[PDB]
Symmetry: D2
Subunit: 114 residues, 4 copies
């Protein structure tokens, strides 16, 4: 299983944030440009298994971009945030990191889990 | 008064997020480059007056960057998030937009206020 | 001005939580009795001025009850929480305490403000 | 497994809220009495298995009380909230209900999960 996980929750409607596109990036330590690692689409439970392998999960700065505008558009409603990018520092690669997103049309929140 | 306002709250300590650098950008819709509009620092109450003028507040996509790593570093602690960017769409410029940040070392939240 | 303030934000719609009933209680330190101090109704800005006088703001355990179920029902929608009570300790009676509620139908959050 | 689950997260330190006392109550349909159903303590993952049996999970109003002040006191710190109660309505007894607590010394939040 992936050492990096997520969970998207639609807190306006009280259901998982299903079928949301998420793109995972890692900061290039040489040039400070962003490199794309992979993309995923959350399942029915708002989760996105297999984002990265233990082998590729090296220390660095990572970015998860949630396509929140597109998600809401597919539910027939507008979102204040066209997308959400969460940028976080990974230093100890043996810990598990859970990076969730609690979302409404006009709010969001996240926290570090394990 | 600026039609765009913020408020940074340190929810780990229950005090305002004072002396945090905030940078406001707007997307260039012809290119797709972000250009800096204003750089501010939050005051004792965690607020940042004068982010934009009414004249300069036009429809578009805006980004508020909060220098969360630098803020926490100055209090002698680390943050999971090196910075936080909140990206939002503005279509109606006759409304006030309040874009706060509630912050701990390991979580953050925002919402659209008036 | 009241040393205790609040602010209710409907984070599902990005608007103030107007016309919500809020009841303030203080714990009777001898019995297990909550005494009702004041009842209020949030204004168009989602606020409720005059919750308590400085003279009446003594050390103790306070409770603010927000009628969330009634609020949503008047909006024609259900809420997971029939009401919300926030219980808090006042020790230093010379500071300002702001005790807001950020609400959707399926979530809420609060924090200590000034 | 219990059809009601919880998860306490210490979002100040980015760790699970382990060893926190949790008491589950249900409102009496006839009297207005709250009755204790289960008392538990969170495990090292901040979770509390066995809150209720499937047979005992009937429609009604439930209340989860989290002993937040005692949690922080064991850690040598004060909390603004001496305890937190979340009151919620169970209408559909076939669903799973997850009722977490995201907590700092001066904030908390919850949402309805499944």
């Amino acid at each position: 299983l992936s050492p990096l996980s997520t969970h998207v929750l639609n807190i306006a409607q009280g259901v998982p944030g299903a079928n949301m596109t998420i793109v995972l990036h890692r900061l290039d330590p040489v040039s400070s440009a962003w490199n794309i690692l992979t993309t995923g689409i959350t399942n029915d439970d708002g989760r996105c298994p297999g984002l990265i392998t233990k082998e590729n999960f090296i220390a660095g700065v990572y970015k998860m971009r949630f396509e929140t505008g597109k998600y809401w558009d597919a539910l027939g409603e507008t979102c204040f945030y066209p997308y959400v990018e969460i940028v976080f520092t990974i230093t100890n690669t043996s810990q598990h990191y859970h990076v969730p997103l609690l979302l409404s049309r006009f709010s969001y929140s996240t926290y570090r889990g394990s």
